[PDB]
């Protein structure tokens, strides 16, 4: 559970809530 702008697709695979996971930044 993390908020947008917290890394999801280079280095995570989930965050909290509405996160499309880019390249540097959650969401």
């Given at each position: 559970?993390?908020?947008r702008g917290?890394?999801?697709l280079?280095?995570?695979s989930g965050c909290c809530n509405s996160p499309g996971c880019i390249f540097g930044i959650c969401a």
């Open positions: 559970c993390i908020p917290g890394i999801c280079v280095a995570l």
